[PDB]
Design a protein around this motif. Structure first.
Motif, PDB file in Angstrom:
ATOM      1  N   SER B   5       0.827  -1.198   0.000  1.00 40.61           N
ATOM      2  CA  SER B   5       0.000   0.000   0.000  1.00 40.61           C
ATOM      3  C   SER B   5       0.866   1.254   0.000  1.00 40.61           C
ATOM      4  N   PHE B   6       1.315   1.658   1.189  1.00 40.55           N
ATOM      5  CA  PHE B   6       2.144   2.852   1.375  1.00 40.55           C
ATOM      6  C   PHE B   6       2.559   3.487   0.055  1.00 40.55           C
ATOM      7  N   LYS B   7       1.884   4.567  -0.321  1.00 43.86           N
ATOM      8  CA  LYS B   7       2.231   5.275  -1.544  1.00 43.86           C
ATOM      9  C   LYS B   7       3.131   6.464  -1.228  1.00 43.86           C
ATOM     10  N   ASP B   8       3.734   6.437  -0.046  1.00 45.02           N
ATOM     11  CA  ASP B   8       4.700   7.454   0.329  1.00 45.02           C
ATOM     12  C   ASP B   8       6.105   6.883   0.173  1.00 45.02           C
ATOM     13  N   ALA B   9       6.466   5.962   1.061  1.00 47.22           N
ATOM     14  CA  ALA B   9       7.769   5.311   1.003  1.00 47.22           C
ATOM     15  C   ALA B   9       7.773   4.160   0.006  1.00 47.22           C
TER      16      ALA B   9
END
Lengths: 50, 50
Positions: B5-9
């Motif tokens: 998921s995490f669309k930041d890191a």
């Protein structure tokens, strides 16, 4: 007269050296040594002759 | 999965090599390098074309 290894610089990737020295024609004969000046106790370009 | 998921890191999970010393086991590795002291951003080109 006897060069000086002053600083390091870079030449397209590689680090090399910068050398300070007098021009050739300013150091070929004994009289060229007089041609060199030194700033005095106060700003006075004193020839080596002195 | 969860970490996908995490669309930041950009998290990755994996297990150490079998033997714990730079073990790519079945996995190659390589160094691109500029023998001809060409640019650094020329390297980047080289890598990215690779």
């Amino acid at each position: 007269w006897g060069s000086s290894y002053v600083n390091d610089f870079i030449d397209r990737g590689r680090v090399k050296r910068v050398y300070l020295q007098g021009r050739p024609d300013a150091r070929m004969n004994p009289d060229d040594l007089s041609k060199w000046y030194v700033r005095n106790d106060k700003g006075e370009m004193v020839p080596f002759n002195a | 999965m969860h970490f996908f998921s995490f669309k930041d890191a950009m998290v990755f999970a994996f297990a150490p090599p079998s033997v714990l010393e730079l073990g790519n086991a079945t996995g190659f590795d390589l160094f691109l390098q500029d023998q001809a002291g060409v640019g650094h951003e020329v390297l980047l080109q080289a890598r990215n074309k690779f």
